[PDB]
Amino acid sequence: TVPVALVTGAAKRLGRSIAEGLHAEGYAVCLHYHRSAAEANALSATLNARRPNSAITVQADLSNVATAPVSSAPVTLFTRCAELVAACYTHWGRCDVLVNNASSFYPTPLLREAMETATADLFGSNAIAPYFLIKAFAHRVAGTPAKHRGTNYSIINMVDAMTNQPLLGYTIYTMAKGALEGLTRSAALELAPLQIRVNGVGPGLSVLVDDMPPAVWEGHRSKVPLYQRDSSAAEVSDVVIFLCSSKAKYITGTCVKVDGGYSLTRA
Amino acid sequence: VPVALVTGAAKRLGRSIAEGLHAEGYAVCLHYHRSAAEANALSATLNARRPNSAITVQADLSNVATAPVTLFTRCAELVAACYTHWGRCDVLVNNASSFYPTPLLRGDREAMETATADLFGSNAIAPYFLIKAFAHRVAGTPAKHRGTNYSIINMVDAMTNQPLLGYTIYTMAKGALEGLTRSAALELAPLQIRVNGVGPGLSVLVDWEGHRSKVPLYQRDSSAAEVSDVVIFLCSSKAKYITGTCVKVDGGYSLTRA
Amino acid sequence: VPVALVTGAAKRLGRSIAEGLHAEGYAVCLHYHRSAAEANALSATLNARRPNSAITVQADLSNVATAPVTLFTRCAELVAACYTHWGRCDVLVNNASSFYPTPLLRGDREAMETATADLFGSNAIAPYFLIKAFAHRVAGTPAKHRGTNYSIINMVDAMTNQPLLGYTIYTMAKGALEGLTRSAALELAPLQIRVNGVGPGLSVLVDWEGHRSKVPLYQRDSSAAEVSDVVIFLCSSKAKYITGTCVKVDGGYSLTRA
Amino acid sequence: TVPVALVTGAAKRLGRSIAEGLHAEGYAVCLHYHRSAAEANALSATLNARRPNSAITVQADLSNVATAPVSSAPVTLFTRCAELVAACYTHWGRCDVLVNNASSFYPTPLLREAMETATADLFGSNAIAPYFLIKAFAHRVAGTPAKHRGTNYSIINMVDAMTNQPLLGYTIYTMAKGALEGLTRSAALELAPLQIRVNGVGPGLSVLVDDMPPAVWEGHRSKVPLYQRDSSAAEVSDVVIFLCSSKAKYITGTCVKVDGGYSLTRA
Ligand SMILES: NC(=O)C1=CN([C@@H]2O[C@H](COP(=O)(O)OP(=O)(O)OC[C@H]3O[C@@H](n4cnc5c(N)ncnc54)[C@H](OP(=O)(O)O)[C@@H]3O)[C@@H](O)[C@H]2O)C=CC1
Ligand SMILES: NC(=O)C1=CN([C@@H]2O[C@H](COP(=O)(O)OP(=O)(O)OC[C@H]3O[C@@H](n4cnc5c(N)ncnc54)[C@H](OP(=O)(O)O)[C@@H]3O)[C@@H](O)[C@H]2O)C=CC1
Ligand SMILES: NC(=O)C1=CN([C@@H]2O[C@H](COP(=O)(O)OP(=O)(O)OC[C@H]3O[C@@H](n4cnc5c(N)ncnc54)[C@H](OP(=O)(O)O)[C@@H]3O)[C@@H](O)[C@H]2O)C=CC1
Ligand SMILES: NC(=O)C1=CN([C@@H]2O[C@H](COP(=O)(O)OP(=O)(O)OC[C@H]3O[C@@H](n4cnc5c(N)ncnc54)[C@H](OP(=O)(O)O)[C@@H]3O)[C@@H](O)[C@H]2O)C=CC1
Ligand SMILES: CN(Cc1cnc2nc(N)nc(N)c2n1)c1ccc(C(=O)N[C@@H](CCC(=O)O)C(=O)O)cc1
Ligand SMILES: CN(Cc1cnc2nc(N)nc(N)c2n1)c1ccc(C(=O)N[C@@H](CCC(=O)O)C(=O)O)cc1
Ligand SMILES: CN(Cc1cnc2nc(N)nc(N)c2n1)c1ccc(C(=O)N[C@@H](CCC(=O)O)C(=O)O)cc1
Ligand SMILES: CN(Cc1cnc2nc(N)nc(N)c2n1)c1ccc(C(=O)N[C@@H](CCC(=O)O)C(=O)O)cc1
């Protein structure tokens, strides 16, 4: 049987490595994107060239805002999330794995309309959208006759090993990852009767090159105890792939740091 | 005369905190949403004990616009009310909180959206804006006239790490509130504003034998004072080196397993 | 008149805790190992303030036999000393602790063995036996005459989760002490004995700019009182619902990263 | 190249599944035992029959006590630990992985000579021995010319997902696993310059059958959220095997619970 994975924010960086890793194990993957349409579609062609009808793309703004319909009233985040899960059942009749990877990240310093949009985008992508996606995912397994349910349902939330040692100026982001840790434990307990495992993976510093200038990149990366560098995308994605595997079937409600020991440091 | 702003101060733990802060000598702003009678009464009682020592401000802390006025603005006005009235705000206790189920399994969408805005707003988004407004006011006060003992206390939950079945949005919001405690504690340290949490286990359940009987210490839920006295302590000059920490007040219930 | 047993009470934080407990009215047993002069002096000062309010007992708390006498026996005698003298022991503060490096990399074996016995004994094995002896005495006292406020405070470390390079045995012993706090808090709940921890960050470093300057709140280490006042609070009847918990007193240093 | 793993307490149950799992990946394994000599030696024959010269056995009491020499003065735990690591270099010239699995577990209620032996056995097996074994392991890699060091050194400590919700009456055991968590973080930081990763795996309830009578076994196992049963030995060992793999190379200083969500419960 060919299981299916829905990966949010899958066009590049960590999300693309998670989609590639799952595809390498045999999963058909639904690649969600927000602004990186070209990149998502290129990845999709690359995957379908390797194995036909093994990848599809779907667009969505996961911020906690209402959007205009694509054909009466404004569409809610809840609906958009339900439609992402639906795309998987419509195309392949199942959704075995959900990886909540999409996430906005920018400052919200404590010391007008921008603040409201930042709250909805940072909390929606990192926490409210994952909540609605898990709810739609669980509803679809619950509506599937037991004799037709898959045998290895897994949800992975991408959290952050370092949020307990806050990055100064990123309060809303930090709060939203703490809510995501709370969703991981609450959903793991609640969904355990359906055999749906829910776990987190929390990178420390990963693929810094694209986000920081040389000198800043060098300076951050030097404080990681193990290897004195940021991780590669595969160093993170291989752990997500292992948690979705049948070998990790007794693991639920846990968050695994993939941080090279950065959380063990002190100023 | 120091000033304390207590959210959800009309009754139960919020009332107990206001009383305790009032006994150490603070002037207290009693925020309420639906409990106007109870709020006004408490205020009258406190003013009877010591004139012009209590006021009341109403506000919905759900993350919704009202007749428009955003949540932020409402939060800022609550902080502005302490200044306007008494010219200062030294303590802030984020206690108001909605709490009911949001089951993952089994007009409905609109109610779901109201529930996320109410549970997330009261437990996390409002506390954030309140913290941001409190900070902005301390920063704007010339160093020479600042208070010497600014403390912000967030009421968390000792048991959210062992989730209550069917309360996901609430649990997620308390997790966001723990994050806010650590982040604001770090960022507001230069202004000497301490930010800490207090996490009750089972408290004032009546205001049940199945639940109470599982608490290791005393086999009962706590009284309101058993929690507010901890909150007053954290606000005292003696807990001056304590910041970014959450103190459980749960009789050992978090030490238990099924 | 309640009685407190403070280990490593001769100076620094231990001295500050004894002073603070003495000011709330407790009779205090001042344990010491090598600091006889300082211990005896403190005792004289306290007895000058209030007659027959302080004593001194010497004991090595390393996990070694002495001239044989085991550590357990020595621990039991320390508890027996409070009873013998004043007929009661209501509070126990496990503060004594050895702290020096045990590097993983780069007669030697005998010194390694002395180091494990001293660091593990003082920070964890002694506290265990002391707790076991304290419990045994409360259990043996007819319910009718027990105290009404038994508290055991273990001095932990807010920063052991971000280890100091080269102090493995010490870090492991503080981890064992956190375990003891939770286990004894759960097991001693029926006898109403509370067991909690207090974890300093950087305190009384002189009794350094590199270290101090990294503390978010105040950019300095704490004073002794900034830590002992927390310990006295936990021992007070007002923190009666608090059990099995560790309170950090670190100025936010545990919130930092390299 | 054939890497070597030293597994303590490897004769049965979880330890034997960890040794079997590592051997299946190609490692030569040194099987340490204390009282289960016959069982250790049988496993050793089974492994060597599958692949010659791939398994050896070594005996040792890991309690923090001195023992009589096997040929002047009484031998210390430190020496016995160093000799376990030495056995691997003597036989195969290397020791790539160390799994600290051996552990005593029995009550030490708070409410004569037995207490001293319990303290040394419970703290030695669960914490002091792991400390000395890691120290000997690190010393041997440090003494190996860099050009000859292996490329994937990993130490795994078996901890306990449930020690933060203490089992009534097991104080010394609980304290010793807390010290083992402290050793995991301290050693991960200190050894990171040598690229030696140190992580923990913490089962919840596993292979209960042998340790509990039917009715008690049934009652405990029913409180696990996921599956309402205790785990199998492989459900735990597959996670240890994954953490020793090159795919887990950016993970250090972390403890992964394998508990079916049991730590998420409350009384
Ligand atoms: N990189 C690192 O060091 C760290 C990573 N993590 C976590 O790992 C995960 C992956 O990290 P990384 O690859 O760096 O993440 P990115 O910052 O690269 O974001 C991944 C994607 O999320 C999407 N996204 C952002 N906002 C929205 C939105 N409003 N609606 C829908 N999608 C949105 C984007 O899609 P598009 O481009 O299509 O718009 C983007 O490509 C994240 O959850 C992150 O928080 C945690 C700690 C560190
Ligand atoms: N009680 C317990 O066992 C526990 C409590 N806690 C925490 O302690 C704190 C106090 O607990 P408790 O006293 O039980 O709290 P309540 O359930 O009694 O609520 C306190 C108050 O908050 C207010 N509130 C609710 N929704 C809103 C809203 N949308 N806008 C503004 N105000 C709102 C109410 O005001 P009004 O009545 O005026 O409308 C209410 O009186 C809470 O943060 C709670 O999560 C943690 C764990 C356990
Ligand atoms: N100071 C700090 O920054 C921090 C302290 N803490 C903790 O707070 C507590 C108090 O700290 P601090 O005041 O610095 O402690 P110290 O380093 O000053 O030691 C306190 C005392 O413990 C005693 N002691 C040491 N070894 C033994 C032994 N083998 N047997 C009996 N007694 C012994 C000593 O007694 P004598 O002098 O009479 O021999 C000594 O005065 C400790 O548990 C410590 O780990 C935690 C983090 C930081
Ligand atoms: N089973 C479970 O539910 C749980 C397991 N864990 C942990 O997982 C690991 C494996 O668990 P499990 O298989 O149940 O363990 P066992 O209790 O079966 O013990 C494993 C082995 O440890 C050895 N051992 C005990 N004392 C000593 C000693 N003094 N010196 C040397 N070796 C000694 C034994 O060797 P021999 O037989 O050769 O004497 C024994 O076979 C342990 O660290 C345990 O604490 C944690 C939580 C739950
Ligand atoms: C660790 N990290 C990498 C990084 C890149 N993309 C991500 N994307 C998401 N969704 N989540 C992350 N955690 C994330 N992290 C970082 C960390 C700090 C700064 C940095 O400090 N940047 C600010 C400035 C710092 C400040 O506000 O003081 C900037 O915008 O330049 C950048 C990237
Ligand atoms: C601790 N608590 C009291 C209580 C009362 N008011 C509060 N108010 C707020 N704001 N926050 C709280 N945590 C809170 N807690 C509890 C604890 C357990 C259950 C109980 O087990 N309840 C469920 C079961 C859930 C379900 O199956 O729907 C329920 O329906 O409430 C209720 C209240
Ligand atoms: C917080 N502290 C003060 C201090 C003083 N006495 C104590 N006494 C006890 N019992 N426990 C403590 N934690 C303690 N702490 C510190 C903190 C850092 C360093 C410091 O960085 N030191 C190293 C570096 C280690 C090395 O490379 O060997 C050292 O040699 O002590 C020293 C003392
Ligand atoms: C979860 N577990 C399985 C089990 C079996 N072997 C192990 N072996 C080790 N080394 N470590 C473990 N954690 C471990 N755990 C348990 C848990 C409780 C009891 C049980 O309660 N046993 C006591 C009695 C309980 C009590 O003392 O009150 C007994 O000896 O019968 C037994 C096994």
User: ∠ CA B187-A200-D233 to the nearest 5 degrees?
Assistant: 135
Neighbours of C258 (CB within 10 A): 15
Query: Any chain C CB within 8 A of the CB of D150?
Result: no
**Do residues C255 and C228 touch, judged by C-beta distance below 8 A?**
no
Cα distance between residue A27 and residue A54, in whole Å: 7
Question: Could you give the number of structural domains in chain B?
Answer: 1
DSSP category for residue D232: P
How far, rounded to the nearest angstrom, does the alpha carbon of residue B7 sit from its chain's CA centroid? 6
* SS3 state of residue A217: helix
Q: What method did the depositors use to determine the structure?
A: X-ray
Neighbours of A67 (CB within 10 A): 14
Cα distance between residue D178 and residue D173, in whole Å: 9
Q: What is the CATH number of the domain that holds B15?
A: 3.40.50.720
Q: Does A80 contact ligand 1 (Cβ within 6 A)?
A: no
Residues 6+ apart with CB under 8 A from C116: C102, C169, D64, D128, D131
Chain A: partners with 3+ C-beta pairs within 8 Å: B, C, D
DSSP category for residue D76: P
Ligand 5 centroid – CA A65 distance (Å)? 24
Closest atom of ligand 8 to D210 CA is 5
D24 is in an annotated binding site: yes
Nearest chain C residue (CA) to B216:
C189
Cα distance between residue D160 and residue D177, in whole Å: 7
Resolution in A: 1.8
Residue of D156, D250, D255, D266 best to disrupt the A interface, most CBs of A under 10 A: D250
Query: Any chain D CB within 8 A of the CB of A225?
Result: yes
For a substitution probing ligand 2, which of B15, B30, B33 has the most ligand atoms within 8 Å of its CB? Answer: B33
Query: Any chain C CB within 8 A of the CB of B149?
Result: no
Cα distance between residue B95 and residue C181, in whole Å: 29
Nearest chain A residue (CA) to C212:
A267
Interchain CB distance below 8 Å, C244 and B254: yes
* SS3 state of residue D56: strand
Q: Which residues pair with C193 in a beta bridge?
A: C150
Q: Which residues sit directly before a break in chain A (C to N > 2.5 Å)?
A: 71, 111
DSSP B164-177: PTTBHHHHHHHHHH
Active-site position among C167, C170, C241, C253: C170
Interchain CB distance below 8 Å, B257 and D264: no
**Nearest 10 degrees: Cα torsion B161, B164, B169, B175:** -20
Q: Compute φ and ψ for D257, nearest 5 degrees.
A: -75, 140
Burial readout C202-225 (b: 16 or more C-beta within 10 A, e: otherwise): bbbeeeeeeeeebbbbbebbbebb
Cα distance between residue B196 and residue B17, in whole Å: 15
Token representation of residue B164: 């209550």
Q: Whose CA is nearest to atom 8 of ligand 8?
A: D105
Cα distance between residue A255 and residue A243, in whole Å: 10
Cα distance between residue B196 and residue B185, in whole Å: 7
For a substitution probing ligand 1, which of A64, A103, A229, A255 has the most ligand atoms within 8 Å of its CB? Answer: A103
Chain D: partners with 3+ C-beta pairs within 8 Å: A, B, C
In angstroms, the first-to-last Cα distance of chain C is 48
* SS3 state of residue A145: coil
**Do residues B30 and B55 touch, judged by C-beta distance below 8 A?**
yes
Q: Which residues pair with B102 in a beta bridge?
A: B167
Which residue of D164, D263, D266 is in closest CB contact with B253?
Answer: D266
Q: Which residues sit directly before a break in chain D (C to N > 2.5 Å)?
A: 71, 111
Least Cα distance to A110 among B72, C118, B122 occurs for B72
Token representation of residue A199: 């776990």
Neighbours of B67 (CB within 10 A): 4
Residue of B182, B241, B257 best to disrupt the C interface, most CBs of C under 10 A: B241
Least Cα distance to C65 among D127, D113, D132, D130 occurs for D113
**Do residues B66 and B54 touch, judged by C-beta distance below 8 A?**
no
Nearest chain C Cα distance for residue D162, angstroms: 11
Cα distance between residue D123 and residue B8, in whole Å: 49
**Do residues C27 and C2 touch, judged by C-beta distance below 8 A?**
yes
Cα distance between residue B61 and residue C244, in whole Å: 33
Residues 6+ apart with CB under 8 A from A231: A203, A204, A205, A206, A207, A258, A259, A260, D250
For a substitution probing ligand 4, which of D103, D159, D237, D257 has the most ligand atoms within 8 Å of its CB? Answer: D103
Q: Compute φ and ψ for D24, nearest 5 degrees.
A: -65, -25
Cα distance between residue D102 and residue D216, in whole Å: 24
Taking CA atoms, C180 is separated from C97, C185, D110, D176, in Å, by: 15, 8, 11, 9
**Do residues D258 and D238 touch, judged by C-beta distance below 8 A?**
no
Helix (H) or strand (E) holding D55: strand D55-59
Cα distance between residue A100 and residue A15, in whole Å: 9
B24 is in an annotated binding site: yes
Which residue of C105, C180, C186 is in closest CB contact with D138?
Answer: C105
**Nearest 10 degrees: Cα torsion C99, C104, C108, C109:** 100
DSSP category for residue C102: B
DSSP category for residue C104: S
Query: Any chain B CB within 8 A of the CB of A19?
Result: no
* SS3 state of residue B187: helix
* SS3 state of residue B101: coil
In angstroms, the first-to-last Cα distance of chain D is 50
**Do residues D89 and D143 touch, judged by C-beta distance below 8 A?**
no
What's at C46, amino acid-wise?
L
How far, rounded to the nearest angstrom, does the alpha carbon of residue A108 sit from its chain's CA centroid? 22
- Which residues of B are marked as active site? 170
Closest atom of ligand 6 to B221 CA is 1
Chain B: partners with 3+ C-beta pairs within 8 Å: A, C, D
What's at D208, amino acid-wise?
L
C29 is in an annotated binding site: yes
Ligand 4 centroid – CA A251 distance (Å)? 21
Q: Which residues pair with A201 in a beta bridge?
A: A158, A256
**Nearest 10 degrees: Cα torsion C103, C108, C109, C113:** -70
Token representation of residue C59: 């004991």
**Do residues C251 and C222 touch, judged by C-beta distance below 8 A?**
yes
DSSP A184-201: HHHHHHHHGGGTEEEEEE
Query: Any chain A CB within 8 A of the CB of C84?
Result: no
Q: Compute φ and ψ for A103, nearest 5 degrees.
A: -170, 130
Interchain CB distance below 8 Å, C257 and A263: yes
Nearest chain C residue (CA) to A162:
C257
Cα distance between residue B5 and residue C13, in whole Å: 35
Ligand 7 centroid – CA C178 distance (Å)? 19
Ligand 5 centroid – CA B184 distance (Å)? 18
Nearest chain D Cα distance for residue C242, angstroms: 16
Q: Compute φ and ψ for C110, nearest 5 degrees.
A: -65, -35
**By residue range, what is the domain housing residue B167?**
1-258
Q: Does B97 contact ligand 6 (Cβ within 6 A)?
A: yes
Nearest chain D Cα distance for residue A237, angstroms: 9
Cα distance between residue C26 and residue B239, in whole Å: 21
Helix (H) or strand (E) holding C54: strand C54-58
Ligand 3 centroid – CA C82 distance (Å)? 21
β-pairing, D55-59 vs D28-33, is: parallel
Q: Exposed, middle or buried, C148 (CB in 10 Å: 0-12/13-18/19+)?
A: exposed
Interchain CB distance below 8 Å, A264 and C162: yes
Neighbours of A5 (CB within 10 A): 27
Nearest chain B Cα distance for residue D163, angstroms: 9
Ligand 5 centroid – CA C227 distance (Å)? 35
